[PDB]
Design a binder for this molecule. Structure first.
Ligand SMILES: CS(=O)(=O)Nn1c(=O)[nH]c2cc([N+](=O)[O-])c(-n3ccnc3)cc2c1=O
Ligand SMILES: N[C@@H](CCC(=O)O)C(=O)O
Lengths: 259, 257
């Protein structure tokens, strides 16, 4: 078997630089949930591999003018990498150009509050205005609310689009900082995975509340025609059924946690 | 006309009240009935809903190595596609193809209200309250194959338990919980557990969190000309907000409690 080129992304706690990474080389430089995942996938599929960080540090979107895919997805479609093992969301536009395994992690839109905020659900948020709430100013979460035919979510959308000042943010970091500087009066809506992770880091002043508002997954991606597709897919399923993915999630979110 | 295999399971596929006087696809109603319509429309095919012959989900017989249920119907050419609460699993994915999940779920515990049990660990450490699973489905296989201590102990008890803790249909497991005065707890998927919790006589409840994390997919036989279109159609329907609305319509909107 040829050395498999794995593309991945520096996003905590999926892939991070080890403590002494400057004293290390190759795959030993990195650690995290997706580093452990890549080792398990390689073992089950009988390949050796090289972890490479995606050049542009992006996930994969198609430029609407140039029609060029950036990110890990571009690296797959242009033949620059053999497989992407990262927190890459399974979406229609990507599935049209690459193959995804079944999900290795389930996630969805969720509520981030400052600790002690009287909110426990989307329902709770939808029936008041004292606590302002919002999303990234563009992307899937904003559009989820815009599209939603569910009453509580349409109610939330109607509030959010009218709200002044803007309840929207340019970046995830802006949204998190806005929850923290807000004294309980702002809730941020983001993916549960990131929400649960931030819950477990210092300052330790935020928490996740309520069910997930929708249902998405991260998948392992291969270019179309990859001889790895079937085996990768089965390996993800095997690892899930053995409880290994749950184990890794617990490890990287909680065992490594700081709160 | 595509032959669609499915299973009678509330609220996915249900006989309409006036079914004896109805014909074809109009006999049935539910989440998976609505989903079959959307998928067929998106993929541009005609279809007939046919309830699985043996009323099972699909397991490989340990003696004969023959598949039963919906998986059997796909693998032996009795049906072209399965649109049902069919759990995506390793052993099935080896013999048929699944779309991406149209719904997420995990194994959960159903109790008669007031049963002094709140976790799987609670259950494993006592004999007074009997507990079991559906036969021929993924939950039984989850416990059978499990190497996790708590669930291992649970399977050991379950495989030996007298009389049998296993049931043939979900409605049987639920009727058993309701008839047994707290002496029987049922292990079922969170989706169905939550539905029943919101149905009269409102005498059951879900306890603890899910035991695992998984999804239902639409299944096709290997080499099906339908595989790619169906897979993409599920993602499109999810991103449209349509799968969430359908779940709302059949769970929350029809809630009796
Ligand atoms: C929106 S998309 O089409 O699904 N692309 N996409 C992914 O696939 N995975 C992601 C994972 C993360 N993340 O932190 O794990 C973030 N992230 C980064 C900072 N906050 C969140 C963004 C994305 C992201 O944008
Ligand atoms: N959805 C399961 C059946 C229900 C259960 O096992 O609890 C399957 O496809 O096998």
């Amino acid at each position: 078997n040829k050395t498999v080129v794995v593309t991945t992304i520096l996003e905590s706690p999926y892939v991070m630089m080890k403590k002494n990474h400057e004293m290390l080389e190759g795959n030993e430089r990195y650690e995290g949930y997706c580093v452990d995942l890549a080792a398990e996938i390689a073992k089950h599929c009988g390949f050796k591999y090289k972890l490479t960080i995606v050049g542009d540090g992006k996930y994969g979107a198609r430029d609407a003018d140039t029609k060029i895919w950036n990110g890990m997805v571009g690296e797959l479609v242009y033949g620059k990498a053999d497989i992407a093992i990262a927190p890459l969301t399974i979406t229609l536009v990507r599935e049209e150009v690459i193959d995804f395994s079944k999900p290795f992690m389930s996630l969805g839109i969720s509520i981030m509050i400052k600790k002690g905020t009287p909110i426990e659900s989307a329902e709770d948020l939808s029936k008041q205005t004292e606590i302002a709430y919002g999303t990234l100013d563009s992307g899937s979460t904003k559009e989820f609310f815009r599209r939603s035919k569910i009453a509580v979510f349409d109610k939330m959308w109607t509030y959010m689009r009218s709200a002044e000042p803007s309840v929207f943010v340019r970046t995830t970091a802006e949204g998190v900082a806005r929850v923290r500087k807000s004294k309980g009066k702002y809730a941020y809506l983001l993916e549960s995975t990131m929400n649960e992770y931030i819950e477990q880091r210092k300052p330790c002043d935020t928490m996740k509340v309520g069910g997930n508002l929708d249902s998405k997954g991260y998948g392992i991606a291969t270019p179309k025609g990859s001889s790895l597709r079937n085996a990768v897919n089965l390996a993800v399923l095997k690892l899930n059924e053995q409880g290994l993915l749950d184990k890794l999630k617990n490890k990287w979110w909680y065992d490594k946690g700081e709160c």
